[PDB]
Amino acid sequence: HGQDAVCEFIATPVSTDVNYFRRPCNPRGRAAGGVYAGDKEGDVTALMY
């Protein structure tokens, strides 16, 4: 059919809501990205952690 795309696995806990997955979401669980930040030096890591 073509080249085989490589699946993955990330150990996430059981009782999270499935409603986080019925939408376009981030696999990390928390919203990442430098687009979301503000005007400060350390916002990009502040979004992450």
């Binding site: 919203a31 979301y36 930040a37 503000g38 400060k40 916002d43 502040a46 979004l47």
Partner: protein
């Protein structure tokens, strides 16, 4: 708790207990203890989505 001008309860061992029970872990409560005269402020969130 952002407002000011309500009579707090008597037990100062218990009045601080509620303020550390609602503001601690909240999107809205103050970071600095409230200014006694002016206006409290909302903590600067890392990102706006």
């Amino acid at each position: 708790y952002l407002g000011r001008g309500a009579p707090p309860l008597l037990d100062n061992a218990a009045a601080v207990y509620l303020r550390n029970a609602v503001v601690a872990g909240n999107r809205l409560g103050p970071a600095q203890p409230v200014p006694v005269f002016g206006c409290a402020q909302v903590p600067r969130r890392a990102g706006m989505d």
